[PDB]
Enzyme design. Structure first.
Site, PDB file in Angstrom:
ATOM      1  N   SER A 196      -2.101   5.779  -1.140  1.00  0.00           N
ATOM      2  CA  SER A 196      -3.287   5.040  -0.733  1.00  0.00           C
ATOM      3  C   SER A 196      -3.510   5.130   0.768  1.00  0.00           C
ATOM      4  O   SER A 196      -4.656   5.071   1.227  1.00  0.00           O
ATOM      5  CB  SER A 196      -3.176   3.581  -1.165  1.00  0.00           C
ATOM      6  OG  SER A 196      -3.205   3.464  -2.573  1.00  0.00           O
ATOM      7  N   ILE A 221       0.869  -1.170   0.000  1.00  0.00           N
ATOM      8  CA  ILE A 221       0.000   0.000   0.000  1.00  0.00           C
ATOM      9  C   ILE A 221       0.906   1.221   0.000  1.00  0.00           C
ATOM     10  O   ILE A 221       1.572   1.506   1.004  1.00  0.00           O
ATOM     11  CB  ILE A 221      -0.946   0.016   1.207  1.00  0.00           C
ATOM     12  CG1 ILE A 221      -1.909  -1.168   1.151  1.00  0.00           C
ATOM     13  CG2 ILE A 221      -1.718   1.312   1.260  1.00  0.00           C
ATOM     14  CD1 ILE A 221      -2.835  -1.245   2.337  1.00  0.00           C
ATOM     15  N   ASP A 222       0.934   1.943  -1.116  1.00  0.00           N
ATOM     16  CA  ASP A 222       1.833   3.078  -1.251  1.00  0.00           C
ATOM     17  C   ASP A 222       1.418   4.204  -0.308  1.00  0.00           C
ATOM     18  O   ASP A 222       0.413   4.129   0.402  1.00  0.00           O
ATOM     19  CB  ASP A 222       1.861   3.563  -2.695  1.00  0.00           C
ATOM     20  CG  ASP A 222       0.486   3.626  -3.309  1.00  0.00           C
ATOM     21  OD1 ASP A 222      -0.432   2.983  -2.764  1.00  0.00           O
ATOM     22  OD2 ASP A 222       0.320   4.319  -4.333  1.00  0.00           O
ATOM     23  N   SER A 223       2.215   5.272  -0.307  1.00  0.00           N
ATOM     24  CA  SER A 223       1.970   6.386   0.596  1.00  0.00           C
ATOM     25  C   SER A 223       0.770   7.224   0.183  1.00  0.00           C
ATOM     26  O   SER A 223       0.255   7.988   1.003  1.00  0.00           O
ATOM     27  CB  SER A 223       3.213   7.264   0.678  1.00  0.00           C
ATOM     28  OG  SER A 223       3.545   7.767  -0.600  1.00  0.00           O
TER      29      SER A 223
END
Ligand SMILES: CC(C)(COP(=O)(O)O)[C@H](O)C(=O)NCCC(=O)NCCS
Ligand SMILES: CC(C)(COP(=O)(O)O)[C@H](O)C(=O)NCCC(=O)NCCS
Lengths: 42, 83, 83
Positions: free
Chosen positions: C43, C39-41
């Site tokens: 999202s 989960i990227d920054s």
């Protein structure tokens, strides 16, 4: 005279203070660090 | 949540040192910023700014004027800490 | 004022599902948003936005970066609830 006594003296740091962390936008800076606990005496 | 009076004075005195130059040996809980320490109303503003930056203690402008002694600031910070 | 760890994970996992698609069966308190869940920054920003919209839990930007695991988010929400 006008530059050093008005612009650079008040207007540029005021803009740096309004835009707190957005003055450095591409860099992610904190408005203030993580709060520290009050130090032990002396 | 019980930062002691000595600890708060210790943290406050090393900001008062940098702002003014008064040694922490002089910052005692009964000294007056105006009379004893001779700290004008504009140096109190930066004392409060640096206190908020370092320890997260926010002191508004209307309440900063009613803090006459160092003990008043310590009591304000302790009562704010109690919540 | 004591929303349990299971309840917080249950409410958080159905936001993680809508944001990413990861089933709530995978959202366990030891998984890393970057490494395990991927989960990227950006999202995480909408996870926080929807959490604030749904449950009123506000998580600022400076504190959102230091929440590496799901357990960190649960602990943050519980410590914020404790006040
Ligand atoms: C500057 C201070 C603290 C200085 O007080 P001393 O009595 O000089 C002032 O009176 C005050 O409180 N409030 C006014 C806010 C202000 O001065 N702003 C400057 C913007 S032009
Ligand atoms: C966008 C994010 C969170 C994304 O980080 P990830 O490592 O990709 C960024 O770093 C950040 O915090 N920025 C502060 C605000 C902002 O950057 N951008 C939108 C304004 S143009």
């Amino acid at each position: 005279l006008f530059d050093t006594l008005i612009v650079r003296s008040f207007m540029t740091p005021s803009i740096a203070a309004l835009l707190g962390k957005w003055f450095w936008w591409p860099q992610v800076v904190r408005q203030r660090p993580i709060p520290q606990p009050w130090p032990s005496p002396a | 949540m019980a930062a002691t009076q000595e600890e708060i004075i210790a943290g406050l005195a090393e900001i008062i040192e940098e702002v003014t130059g008064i040694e922490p040996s002089e910052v005692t809980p009964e000294k007056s910023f105006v009379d004893d320490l001779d700290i004008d109303s504009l140096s109190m503003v930066e004392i409060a700014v640096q206190t908020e930056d370092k320890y997260g203690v926010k002191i508004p402008d209307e309440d900063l004027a009613g803090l006459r002694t160092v003990g008043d600031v310590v009591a304000y910070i302790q009562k704010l800490e109690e919540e």
